[PDB]
């Protein structure tokens, strides 16, 4: 796109894609602004991070990420797959 080229080594391009996607679902919805900044801020630092998050702690140390969104990051680096186990 002239100056804005895609990323050669997609590091955190899969995570931000799930935080930026649902993030729109937060603001796009009425009573969903608290969770909005959750992925909107976490996806911002990760989508614009110069390195990869090793464990969930590496995501919490980032400025803007809390323990809720950062907790989901640990599950990403932990196993990677997210079954539908709600218990």
Provide a descriptive summary of the structure in words.
Monomer. Binds single-stranded DNA (ssDNA). Interacts with APEX1, LIG1, LIG3, FEN1, PCNA and XRCC1. Interacts with HUWE1/ARF-BP1, STUB1/CHIP and USP47. Interacts with FAM168A. This is DNA polymerase beta. It comes from Rattus norvegicus (Rat). It is found in: Nucleus; Cytoplasm. Belongs to the DNA polymerase type-X family. By secondary structure, the protein is mostly helical. The chain has a single domain, classed as DNA polymerase beta, N-terminal domain-like (DNA polymerase, domain 1, Orthogonal Bundle), CATH 1.10.150. It has four helices and no strands. Helix 1 packs antiparallel against helix 2. The longest helix has 14 residues. The chain is globular, with a radius of gyration of 14 Å. The termini are far apart.
Descriptors:
mainly alpha; 4 helices; 0% strand; DNA polymerase, domain 1
In short:
The chain is mainly α and 87 residues long. The chain has helices spanning 15-28, 34-47, 56-60, 68-78.
CATH class: Mainly Alpha
Question: What's the count of strands?
Answer: 0
Q: What is the annotated CATH architecture?
A: Orthogonal Bundle
How large a portion of the residues is in β-strands, by DSSP E? under 5%
How many separate domains make up the residues? 1
Alpha-carbon distance between the two ends: 45 Å
Q: Round the Cα radius of gyration to an integer and report it.
A: 14 Å
Which percent bin holds the helix content?
40-55%
Q: How many helices? A: 4
* Element order: H for helix, E for strand: HHHH
What structural category arises from helix and sheet content? mainly alpha
Gross morphology: globular
Superfamily at the CATH H level? DNA polymerase beta, N-terminal domain-like
PDB class: transferase
Keywords: DNA-binding, deoxyribose 5'-phosphate lyase, nucleotidyltransferase, transferase
Assembly: monomeric
Entry title: refined solution structure of the N-terminal domain of DNA polymerase beta
């Amino acid at each position: 796109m002239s100056k804005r080229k895609a990323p050669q080594e997609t590091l955190n391009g899969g995570i931000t894609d799930m935080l930026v996607e649902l993030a729109n679902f937060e603001k796009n919805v009425s009573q969903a602004i608290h969770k909005y900044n959750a992925y909107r801020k976490a996806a911002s630092v990760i989508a614009k991070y110069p390195h990869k998050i090793k464990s969930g702690a590496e995501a919490k140390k980032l400025p803007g990420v809390g323990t809720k969104i950062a907790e989901k990051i640990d599950e990403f680096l932990a196993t990677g797959k997210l079954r539908k186990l709600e218990k």
